[PDB]
Design a protein around this ligand. Structure first.
Ligand SMILES: *CCC(=O)Nc1cc(N(C(=O)NCc2ccccc2)[C@H]2CC[C@H](Nc3ccc(C#N)cn3)CC2)ccc1N1CCC(N(C)C)CC1
Ligand SMILES: [Mg+2]
Lengths: 311, 238
């Protein structure tokens, strides 16, 4: 409860986990209990407007979300300077796992991964919260088999009963409506990125790999069909619908380019990769699909997760 | 993980300022001067009623763990408002708050800011964040005043006049430690109970039936609680 009083000297920095927005991410261990933690350094010494509003956002969101599939912020610590955000230490991220090539996930593994991720996203959506940065690097996996959702700095409240920022998700997982300029979007942007990682867990490669927005839009349209009023009556309302159009009017061929994945998985992937966000799967009904209906996690086993990398 | 931000009137009589020898009426004026400083500064910059109230709440809580004999009231006030702007998503530059603060205070009042008023406010942000335990999100009686008054059906002019006087009572309550006493829902019904007595209004006639009309808005609120909140608001006019 009393956060911000404990000092960082109670932890020992092992190494650098990564580089976040406010600073670097540090692997550390508690000198009193032995618990591994992740520390986010939030510098304010040099900042012109003191404590970053981006970190203030990330703080007051993660302190409203308590869930097994959402990373829990344990405490906040200072030095005596700067502040450090204490998170429960996860063992891996899905991006680093897939890019290594040393891991192979069974459909039993993917069903367990998707059940936790969709359960955590439904919890955030039920609290009217968009993640707005779902990607493989922000899905954290434990050696016990637990999945968690991380980096809520870009998460924003959603008007349930108003406009927000257009370009918010990394391009490989950004839905077609944001590429076309939608600014009053819905939680459906989050279930789309999870559609890209459901397919990515069966390919070890991101589904839609481009670098420019227009070059991205045709890539999805080459798989899901080009955005048209026939399957998505509101394409005509998005700004860059005419300025940013594919080469030709492609046909949806998702059920065959992914014919190798299980039928229940392919049926869920089609429902989650639909062009029209009004026709897109809800996080609540993703767990009611045939692929995630009867997946009791206590009857599962952790995967082949390695322990060392030429990191 | 959620700390408790409410004190008894016995706890409010043993604040760090009282222990260091300050007079209770002197601390009460320091809170009045400081809260009305975050109020005057906030409107001049065009800030929103939650943003002013959040800065004032930070201010009253800051002086439950620090005494006024160690931390000047106005530097802390300007610091609380600067932090309240970021939390409530209406951020104002600290340089503007001080240029404004200099425009409303004396030569001796602004003297608390030192030679570098900007940094003096910046270094205090760390102390304030630890003091508020990083519990940044707070609720104010404004939203509950509107939320509860919406369910009142009756004379539109009398109901609108009711929430107009209760709104200013929410403004005046921010100069007292009522924020450190009762939840925002209790203050919202208290200012409605107070405004209904000054207007000679019977609120329950705008609810269902006759009656403790607030038992449908807030659970188990004895009248002695509401009449105690009314006293501390009315005493501001003495
Ligand atoms: C020497 C190994 C290392 O620390 N490098 C490292 C590790 C990882 N992570 C991995 O899980 N996967 C890499 C991998 C993949 C396959 C097989 C083995 C290893 C980390 C991912 C984050 C985990 N903890 C975590 C993060 C965030 C929160 C929050 N909130 C909580 N917990 C811990 C494991 C990622 C990146 C890297 N590197 C190595 C190179 C470094 N450069 C050189 C500075 C950057 C990051
Ligand atoms: Mg990240």
């Amino acid at each position: 409860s009393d956060w911000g009083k404990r000092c960082v000297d109670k932890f020992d920095i092992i190494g650098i986990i990564g580089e976040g927005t406010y600073g670097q991410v540090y692997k550390a261990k508690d000198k009193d209990t032995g618990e591994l933690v992740a520390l986010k350094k939030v510098r304010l010494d040099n900042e012109k407007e003191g404590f970053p509003i981006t970190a203030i956002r990330e703080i007051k969101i993660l302190r409203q979300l308590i869930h097994r599939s959402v990373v829990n912020m344990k405490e906040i610590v200072t030095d005596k300077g700067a502040f450090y955000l204490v998170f429960e230490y996860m063992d891996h991220d899905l991006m680093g796992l897939l890019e290594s090539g040393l891991v192979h996930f069974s459909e039993d593994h993917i069903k367990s991964f998707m059940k936790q991720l969709m359960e955590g996203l439904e919890y955030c959506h039920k609290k009217n919260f968009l993640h707005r940065d779902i990607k493989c690097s922000n899905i954290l996996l434990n050696n016990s088999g637990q999945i968690k959702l991380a980096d809520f700095g870009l998460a924003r409240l959603y008007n349930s009963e108003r406009p927000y920022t257009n370009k918010v998700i990394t391009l490989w997982y950004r839905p077609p409506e944001l590429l076309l300029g939608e600014e009053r979007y819905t939680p459906a942007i989050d279930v789309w990125s999870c559609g890209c990682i459901l397919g990515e867990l069966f390919t070890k490669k991101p589904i839609f790999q481009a670098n420019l927005e227009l070059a991205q839009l045709e890539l999805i349209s080459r798989l899901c069909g080009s955005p048209c009023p026939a399957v998505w009556p509101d394409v005509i309302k998005l700004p860059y619908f005419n300025t940013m159009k594919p080469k030709k009017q492609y046909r949806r061929r998702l059920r065959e380019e992914f014919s190798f994945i299980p039928s229940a998985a392919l049926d869920l992937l089609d429902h989650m990769l639909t062009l029209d966000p009004s026709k897109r799967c809800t996080a609540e009904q993703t767990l009611q699909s045939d692929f995630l209906k009867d997946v009791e996690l206590s009857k599962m086993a952790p995967p082949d997760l390695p322990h060392w990398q030429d990191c | 993980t959620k700390p408790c931000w409410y004190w008894d009137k016995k706890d409010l009589a043993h604040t760090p300022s009282q222990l260091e020898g300050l007079d209770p009426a002197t601390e009460a004026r320091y809170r009045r001067e400081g809260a009305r400083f975050i109020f005057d500064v906030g409107t001049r910059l065009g800030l929103h009623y939650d943003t002013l109230a959040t800065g004032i709440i930070y201010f009253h809580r800051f002086y439950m763990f620090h005494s006024f004999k160690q931390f000047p009231r106005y530097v802390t006030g300007a610091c609380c408002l600067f932090l309240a702007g970021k939390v409530e998503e209406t951020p104002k530059k600290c340089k503007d708050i001080i240029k404004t603060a200099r425009s409303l205070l004396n030569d001796v009042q602004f003297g608390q800011f030192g030679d570098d008023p900007k940094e003096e406010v910046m270094v205090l942000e760390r102390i304030l964040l630890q003091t508020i335990k990083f519990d940044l999100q707070v609720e104010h009686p404004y939203q509950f005043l509107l939320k509860y008054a919406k369910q009142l059906k009756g004379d539109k002019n009398k109901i609108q006049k009711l929430v107009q006087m209760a709104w200013t009572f929410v403004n005046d309550s921010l100069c007292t430690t009522l924020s450190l006493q009762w939840e925002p829902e209790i203050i919202a019904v208290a200012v409605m109970y107070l405004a209904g007595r000054l207007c000679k209004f019977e609120i329950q006639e705008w609810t269902s039936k006759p009656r403790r009309w607030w038992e449908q808005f807030v659970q188990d609120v004895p009248v002695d609680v509401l009449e105690d909140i009314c006293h501390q608001i009315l005493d501001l006019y003495s």
